[PDB]
Amino acid sequence: MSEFNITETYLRFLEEDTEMTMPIAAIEALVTLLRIKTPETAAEMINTIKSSTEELIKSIPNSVSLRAGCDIFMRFVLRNLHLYGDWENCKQHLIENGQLFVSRAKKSRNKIAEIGVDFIADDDIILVHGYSRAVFSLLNHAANKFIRFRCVVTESRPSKQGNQLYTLLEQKGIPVTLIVDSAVGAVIDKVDKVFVGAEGVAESGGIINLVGTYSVGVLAHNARKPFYVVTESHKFVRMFPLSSDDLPMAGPPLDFTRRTDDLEDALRGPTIDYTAQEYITALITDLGVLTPSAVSEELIKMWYD
Amino acid sequence: EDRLQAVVLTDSYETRFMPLTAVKPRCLLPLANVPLIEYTLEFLAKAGVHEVFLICSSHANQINDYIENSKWNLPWSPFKITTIMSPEARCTGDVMRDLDNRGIITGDFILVSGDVLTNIDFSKMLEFHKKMHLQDKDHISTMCLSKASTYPKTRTIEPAAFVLDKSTSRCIYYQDLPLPSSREKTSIQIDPELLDNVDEFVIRNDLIDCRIDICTSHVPLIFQENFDYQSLRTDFVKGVISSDILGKHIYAYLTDEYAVRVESWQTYDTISQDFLGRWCYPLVLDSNIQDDQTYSYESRHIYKEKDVVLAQSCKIGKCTAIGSGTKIGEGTK
Q1: Which of A41, A57, B113, B150 is least crowded, fewest Cβ atoms below 10 Å from its Cβ?
Q2: DSSP secondary structure string, A279-304?
Q3: Where's it found, cell-wise (chain B)?
Q4: B215 forms bridges with which residues in the sheet?
C-alpha cells in the first residue's frame, strides 16, 4: 500500500541511478501511480493525479523541469483516454501503452545522438554550459565516431556542474579546458559553436535551465555564432514569461535583506534564467532538428483546444 | 558524323618509368587515388563514341580483368570495349599498320597516344575538323593542343616547336627543339620551297603536346606503304609535309585552356597538383565517378573521403587529398 507522493514511490529510484533524470522520473512515478492504483473509474483517476501532481509541484517548487513532466503526463493520458474506448479497454489500453516512456523516453538521448551527429563537424571548438546530459550523449557519440573537435566547459555557478563535465569527458579522452563563466566574452571569438540544454521549453522557445544561459546566449548573438541547444521531445511546459523573469526560487532577484549571522551571499540572486526565440537558432528533438518557430507551433498544436 | 570510332594505345613510355612499371603499366598508375585509364575513357565517353580498340603490348592479362571490374563491360557504357594483345616493344605506328592490315577502322576515328588529361570540348574541335573537310579534300587531320603560355622550357622531356599558318592554321613543319639547359645546338631549319601559298605564318613553341588527333581512315593507308615511319610526330608529320608527298594538308588546333599528357614524373608532379586544384575545371575530383568515391570538398583544396580518422593537432595544409582507411597521428603535418 503506497501513496506515490513524495518518497514512498518517487524518491526511491532517484537514488537508484543518475542516468534517469528528473522529469521522466516523475513520468516513471506517474505511470506507476495509476498502474497499481487503478480505481476502475475514469473520474477519480484524473482526480487522483490532479491531487498528486499539484502536491508534487508543492513537493519541490523550484525544479520546474518536473512541472513540464507534470504538464505532458496529463497530455499523455488525455489523448490516451481518447480513441473512445469507454474506459473499458482504456484501463488496459493505457497500461498496454504503459511502459512506453521507460522504453522510449529513455532512448531519447541516443536518438539525439543518432541525429545530432552533423552539428559538431570537423574541428569545432565547442562551448558547453551546465549538465544537460543529452549533450554528453551527443558528445559520447562524437568520441565513438572518432570525429575531430575540441571542447570548452564553462562554469555552472553556483550549481557546480562544470567541474563534473571536465572530469566526465577527460576520462573519455577529449582535449578540453574548463573556463570560468566570467571569461566567456574574451574567448567567444575563437569559439565557433555553442551547446546548452534547457530544463523546459517555453511557448516562444524557452531556456529555463540555469543561471546564465541567457548571458552566454546574448554573447553568442553579438559573436554571430549558431547558438544551438540540445533537448528532447518531452521537455515542454506552458510556463511562459514576457521578460527574462520566470517564477523565481522564493523571492525577487533584487533582495536587500541583510546577513543575520553567516548566511550565503552568492545565493541571493536567481538560479534560473530565460531566453526567448531571438537568441537561439536551432534545437534538437526526438522528432528531429527543429527551428525556433516550429517549437512554438508544436507547443500550441495540442495545447489550445 | 556518326559512328565515332577510336583507338587507345598505352605502352610507349616504359622507358620513362623503369623503377616502377615492372608489375603494372603506366596507364594503371594512380594520379589522385585512382588510375588514368578512365580519365581518357570518360573523356571519350564525353566524345560520344561507339567502340574503342586497346593496345596492350605488355602486361596484357592485368588490363581486361580491370575492365571486367569496370563499368565498361556492363551494357550501358557509351562504347563496347575491345583489346588487342601484342608482344613487347611494338612501337607507335607499327601498332597502326598491323591494325591497318586487319583494317577494322572505318572513316573518322580518334588517336589517343600517351595518357592524356584535359577539359576541352569535343564539339568545337570537330566542326573545325569538318571546316577542314569543307576547305580541303586533300586534308589529313586536326591536331588539338593547348597553349603553355607563361611557361616555356618546363615541358620536361621534349620541347616541341611548331610553325603553322595564320589563316588556315596548316602546320608548316616540325623540328624538335633541343634541351633548353643545353645552350649549344642553337639552330632550326625550315626549307622555304614549301612556303609558297602561305606568306603570313606563325611559328610557335608553347603548344604543349598531347597527341590527341582525329583523322580519316585514308591517311593510315597513306601511312601503310610508307612503312619506314616509326613515330607519330618525330618522323611522320615532317615527311608528310616536307614535300615528299604532294599536296597533303595536315592542320593543328590551339585551345585557350587545359589539355596535357603525362611524360615523366615531373609531368606527374605538376598536373596532379593542377588537378587537385581547380585548374581542371570542370572535370573535378568531387564528382566521384570511377570507383564511385566518397570525396567531400572543403576549402583550400581538401579532398577527404569518409572513414577518415583525423587525429588531434595535425594541421592539414593546402592542396591535399585523403582516401578512406587512413589514420593520421598526433603532431604530423
Answers
A1: B150
A2: T--EEE-SS-EE-TTHHHHTTTTTT-
A3: Cytoplasm, Cytosol
A4: B109, B141
Select the residue from B296, B306, B312, B316 to test the A interface by mutation, using most A Cβ atoms within 10 A.
B312
Chains A and B: how many Cβ contacts under 8 Å?
Answer: 8
Contact state of A148 with B311 under an 8 Å Cβ cutoff: yes
CB of B309 within 8 Å of a chain A CB? The answer is yes
| Single-letter amino acid, residue B17 | F
- Structure method: cryo-EM
Beta strands in chain A (DSSP E): 125-128, 150-153, 176-178, 193-196, 227-230, 282-284, 289-290
Selection from B308, B302, B310 nearest residue B323 by Cα:
B308
In the numeric block, the cell 604532294 is attached to B246
- How far, in Å, CA of B73 to CA of B88, rounded? 26
DSSP symbol at B57: S
Taken as a whole, chain B contains a residue count of 333
Residue contact B310–A148, C-beta within 8 A: yes
What residue has cell string 556542474? A161
Rounded Cα distance, B127 and B144, in Å: 13
Closest alpha carbon to B141 in B74, B212, B192: B212
| Other residues' Cβ atoms within 10 Å of the Cβ of residue B6 | 21
Would you list the DSSP string of A83-117?
TT-TTTTHHHHHHHHSSSTTTTTTTHHHHHHHHSG
A50 CB near a chain B CB, below 8 Å? no
8 A C-beta contact, residue A76 and residue A45? no
Distances (CA, A) of A194 to A183, A281, B286: 15, 11, 30
**Domains of chain B, start order:** 5-276 (3.90.550.10)
Grid look-up 614549301 returns B194
**How many residues appear in chain A?**
305
Nearest CA to B217 out of B100, B114, B92 is that of B100
Interhelix angle B218-225/B94-102, nearest 10 degrees: 110
